[PDB]
Short mmCIF file of C-alpha atoms in Angstrom, two decimals:
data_model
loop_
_atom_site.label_atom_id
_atom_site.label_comp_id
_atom_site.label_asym_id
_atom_site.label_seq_id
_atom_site.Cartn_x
_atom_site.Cartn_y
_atom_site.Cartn_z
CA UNK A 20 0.00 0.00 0.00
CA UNK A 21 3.15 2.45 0.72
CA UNK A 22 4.07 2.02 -2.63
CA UNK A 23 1.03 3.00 -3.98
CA UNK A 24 0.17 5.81 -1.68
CA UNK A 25 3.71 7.32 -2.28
CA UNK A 26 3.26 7.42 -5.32
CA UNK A 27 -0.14 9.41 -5.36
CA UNK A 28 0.96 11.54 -2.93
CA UNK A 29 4.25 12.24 -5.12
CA UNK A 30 1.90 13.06 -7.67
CA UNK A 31 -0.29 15.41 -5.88
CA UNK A 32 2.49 17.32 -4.41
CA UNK A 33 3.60 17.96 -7.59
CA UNK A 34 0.07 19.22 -9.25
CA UNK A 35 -1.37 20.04 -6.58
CA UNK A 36 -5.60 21.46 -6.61
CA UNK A 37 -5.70 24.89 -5.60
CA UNK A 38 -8.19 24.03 -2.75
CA UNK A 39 -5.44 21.54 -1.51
CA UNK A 40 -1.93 23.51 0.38
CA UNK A 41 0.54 21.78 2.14
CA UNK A 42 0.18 18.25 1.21
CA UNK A 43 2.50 15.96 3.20
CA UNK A 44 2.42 12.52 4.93
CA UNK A 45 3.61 11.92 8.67
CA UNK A 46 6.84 11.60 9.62
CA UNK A 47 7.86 7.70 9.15
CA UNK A 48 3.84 6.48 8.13
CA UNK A 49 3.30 6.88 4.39
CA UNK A 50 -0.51 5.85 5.30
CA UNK A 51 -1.01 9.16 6.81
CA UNK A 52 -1.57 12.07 5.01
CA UNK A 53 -2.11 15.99 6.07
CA UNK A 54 -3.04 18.65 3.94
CA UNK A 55 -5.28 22.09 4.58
CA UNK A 56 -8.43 22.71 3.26
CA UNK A 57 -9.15 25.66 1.68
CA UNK A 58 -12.53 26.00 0.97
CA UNK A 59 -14.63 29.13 -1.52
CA UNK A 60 -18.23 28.65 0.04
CA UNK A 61 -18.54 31.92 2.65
CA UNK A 62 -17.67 31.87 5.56
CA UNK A 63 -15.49 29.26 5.18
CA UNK A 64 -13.14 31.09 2.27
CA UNK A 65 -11.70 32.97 5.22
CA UNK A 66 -9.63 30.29 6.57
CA UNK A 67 -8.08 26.92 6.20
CA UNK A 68 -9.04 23.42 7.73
CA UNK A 69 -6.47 20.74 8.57
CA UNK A 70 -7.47 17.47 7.24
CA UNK A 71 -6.01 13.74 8.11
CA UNK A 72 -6.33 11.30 5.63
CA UNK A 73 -5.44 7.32 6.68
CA UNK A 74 -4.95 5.32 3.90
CA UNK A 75 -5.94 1.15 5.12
CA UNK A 76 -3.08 -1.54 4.46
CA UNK A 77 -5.53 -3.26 1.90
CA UNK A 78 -5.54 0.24 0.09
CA UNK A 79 -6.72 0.67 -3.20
CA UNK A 80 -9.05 -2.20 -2.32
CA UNK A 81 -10.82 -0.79 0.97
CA UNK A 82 -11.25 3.21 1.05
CA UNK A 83 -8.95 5.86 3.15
CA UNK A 84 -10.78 7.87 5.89
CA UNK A 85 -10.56 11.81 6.22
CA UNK A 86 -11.19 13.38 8.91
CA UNK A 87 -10.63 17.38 10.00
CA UNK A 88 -8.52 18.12 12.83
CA UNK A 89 -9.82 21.62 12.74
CA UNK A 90 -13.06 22.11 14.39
CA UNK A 91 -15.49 23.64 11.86
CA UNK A 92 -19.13 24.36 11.96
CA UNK A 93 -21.00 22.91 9.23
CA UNK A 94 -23.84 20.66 9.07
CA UNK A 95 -21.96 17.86 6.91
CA UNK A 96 -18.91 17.78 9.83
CA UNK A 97 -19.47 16.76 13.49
CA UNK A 98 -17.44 17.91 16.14
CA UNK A 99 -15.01 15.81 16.20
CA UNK A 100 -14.36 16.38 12.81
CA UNK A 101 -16.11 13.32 11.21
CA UNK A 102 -17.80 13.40 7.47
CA UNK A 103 -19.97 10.83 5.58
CA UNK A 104 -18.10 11.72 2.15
CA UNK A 105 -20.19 8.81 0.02
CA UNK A 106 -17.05 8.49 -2.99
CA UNK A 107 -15.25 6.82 0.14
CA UNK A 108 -18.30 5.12 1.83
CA UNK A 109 -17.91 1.22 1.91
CA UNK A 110 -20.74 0.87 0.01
CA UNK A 111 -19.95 3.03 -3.04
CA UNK A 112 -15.86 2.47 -2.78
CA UNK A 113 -14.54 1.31 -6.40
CA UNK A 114 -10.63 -0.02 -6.33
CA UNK A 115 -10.30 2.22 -9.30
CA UNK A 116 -11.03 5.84 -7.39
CA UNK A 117 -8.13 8.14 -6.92
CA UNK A 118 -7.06 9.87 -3.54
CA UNK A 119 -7.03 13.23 -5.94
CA UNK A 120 -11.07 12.45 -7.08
CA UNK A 121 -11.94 11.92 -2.87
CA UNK A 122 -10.24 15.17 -1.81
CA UNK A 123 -12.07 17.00 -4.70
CA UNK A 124 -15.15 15.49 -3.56
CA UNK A 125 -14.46 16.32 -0.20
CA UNK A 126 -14.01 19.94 -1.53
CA UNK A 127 -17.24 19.91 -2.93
CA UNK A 128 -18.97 18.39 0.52
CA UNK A 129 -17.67 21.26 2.39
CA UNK A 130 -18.42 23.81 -0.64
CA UNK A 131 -22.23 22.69 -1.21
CA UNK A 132 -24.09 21.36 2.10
CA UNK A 133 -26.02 18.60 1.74
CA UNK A 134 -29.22 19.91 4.42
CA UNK A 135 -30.81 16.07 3.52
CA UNK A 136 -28.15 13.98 5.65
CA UNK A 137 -26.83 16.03 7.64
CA UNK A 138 -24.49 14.72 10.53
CA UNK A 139 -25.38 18.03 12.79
CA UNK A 140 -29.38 18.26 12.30
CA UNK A 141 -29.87 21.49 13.97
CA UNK A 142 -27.20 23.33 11.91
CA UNK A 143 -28.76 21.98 9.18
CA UNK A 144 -32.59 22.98 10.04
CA UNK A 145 -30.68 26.73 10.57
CA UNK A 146 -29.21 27.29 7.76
CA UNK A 147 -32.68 26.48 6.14
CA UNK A 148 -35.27 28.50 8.30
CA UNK A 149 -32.35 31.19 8.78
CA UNK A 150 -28.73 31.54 6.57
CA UNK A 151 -28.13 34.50 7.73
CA UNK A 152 -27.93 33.55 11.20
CA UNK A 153 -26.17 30.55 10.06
CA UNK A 154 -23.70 32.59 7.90
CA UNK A 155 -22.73 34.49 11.49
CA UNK A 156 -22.19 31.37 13.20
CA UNK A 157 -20.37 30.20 11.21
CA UNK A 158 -17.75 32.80 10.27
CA UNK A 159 -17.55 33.32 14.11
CA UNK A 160 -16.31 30.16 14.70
CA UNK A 161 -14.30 29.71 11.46
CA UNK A 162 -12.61 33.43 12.51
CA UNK A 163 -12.38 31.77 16.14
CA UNK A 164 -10.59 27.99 15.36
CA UNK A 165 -9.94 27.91 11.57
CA UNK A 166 -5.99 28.18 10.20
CA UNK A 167 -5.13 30.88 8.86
CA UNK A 168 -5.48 31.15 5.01
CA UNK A 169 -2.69 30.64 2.79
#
């Protein structure tokens, strides 16, 4: 799986997306990635999110996981950073996806809410009935905990 991932990862470095800064793995595990977020959708276009991604040892044949290590408030991302990004989901997970098609994906998830399944139902239910108030919330918390933009 190393082999495979370091390669990817050699190849996203290289061209990276601009959405995607700071792509890297951890120190001595090739099967752990980092990279910030940088989203468009307002309030979140003001900062940066830090993202994990854990690539499995049976990798390209069972999916990575992502997670954010930087709290953010949105309605598709529970607090401890958790998403239900379906291109990785058991379920839908084809051995012939790319790490570079999931982290676009993910781009869009953050970019364009999903208020249908949501993981944080009340967030969602607000910015319905009231995205204004939403929009507040959230830039005060993105302002608060996000990393600062590149």
């Amino acid at each position: 799986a190393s082999m495979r991932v370091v390669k990817e990862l050699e190849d996203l470095q290289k061209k990276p997306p601009p959405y995607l800064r700071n792509l890297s793995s951890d120190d001595a595990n090739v099967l752990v990635w980092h990279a910030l977020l940088l989203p468009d959708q307002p309030p979140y276009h003001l900062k940066a999110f830090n993202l994990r991604i854990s690539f499995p040892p049976e990798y390209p044949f069972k999916p990575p996981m992502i997670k954010f290590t930087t709290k953010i408030y949105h309605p598709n991302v529970d607090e401890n950073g958790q998403i239900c990004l379906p291109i990785i989901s058991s379920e839908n997970w084809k051995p012939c996806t790319k790490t570079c098609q999931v982290l676009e994906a993910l781009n869009v998830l953050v970019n364009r809410p999903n208020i249908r399944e949501p993981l944080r139902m009340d967030l969602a239910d607000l910015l319905t009935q009231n995205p204004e108030l939403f929009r507040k919330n959230a830039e005060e918390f993105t302002l608060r905990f996000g990393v600062d933009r590149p």
